[PDB]
Design a protein around this ligand. Structure first.
Ligand code: HEC
Ligand code: HEC
Ligand SMILES: [Zn+2]
Ligand SMILES: [Zn+2]
Ligand SMILES: [Zn+2]
Ligand SMILES: [Zn+2]
Ligand SMILES: [Zn+2]
Lengths: 106, 106
């Protein structure tokens, strides 16, 4: 999967969570988001001209996905506890993480 | 001013912008936010145990304020053009920057 595919996986599954009815649907979507975040963490932002892995902005790019994965894991803990409404609310807190990286690299 | 004061300056002036009527009110509030962001950039997050300036998470902390200042400057460009509704909307885009740093360090 490429960056576009991983982002649409994140995008579609965030919606699945919002519309979900049980913990299993939420857990399934969060698990898919988690893998897509770690896969996208291997890419580079197309508009960053310096793609060097050790550059500060590439550190920051990968770091943003570690933060996102941490928040996904927080939501998964709630989903695995059966707390559906709570997990859905935690998934909503992802969105500023998405929007922050987008503003900063797009 | 300390970190609490700078954050409440950011907090109060974001509200002033939302309720403003002309470019001058928006510009005045954004200018105050800008100075408070650069002042807060000198502090450290109270819950970060490693306060070393050269550590990655202290780099990230200061970097978040540079991003915020950049967005404030984008909003100021619109305010200085007289585009009040546009400037107010740009100020709204700050909020995920605020919430991102809060989630990550509080
Ligand atoms: C959090 C849950 C999300 C969600 C829902 C999305 N992202 Fe990202 N994203 C990043 C970059 C560099 C791009 C540009 C990619 C490119 O130019 O091809 C994107 C793009 C998107 C899209 C748009 C896809 C398109 O049709 O153009 C969407 C829908 C999307 N993302 C969803 C980088 C990042 C991150 C780096 C740290 C993080 C985190 C996210 N995105 C988070 C999310
Ligand atoms: C963007 C416009 C904002 C706004 C409106 C606020 N912040 Fe921050 N903030 C940061 C840290 C580390 C703290 C904890 C401070 C502490 O423990 O004393 C805060 C706290 C706040 C508050 C709460 C004040 C209180 O009564 O406890 C408020 C209202 C607030 N902030 C507003 C760190 C950062 C950032 C670092 C990169 C950025 C950016 C912001 N905050 C952005 C904003
Ligand atoms: Zn797409
Ligand atoms: Zn960066
Ligand atoms: Zn960051
Ligand atoms: Zn306060
Ligand atoms: Zn960090």
């Amino acid at each position: 999967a490429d960056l576009e595919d991983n982002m649409e996986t994140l995008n579609d599954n965030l919606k699945v969570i919002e519309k979900a009815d049980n913990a299993a649907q939420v857990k399934d979507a969060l698990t898919k988001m988690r893998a897509a975040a770690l896969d996208a963490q291997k890419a580079t932002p197309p508009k960053l001209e310096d793609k060097s892995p050790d550059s500060p902005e590439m550190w920051h790019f990968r770091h943003g996905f570690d933060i996102l994965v941490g928040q996904i894991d927080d939501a998964l803990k709630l989903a695995n506890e059966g707390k559906v409404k709570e997990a859905q609310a935690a998934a909503e807190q992802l969105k500023c993480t998405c929007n922050h990286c987008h503003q900063h690299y797009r």
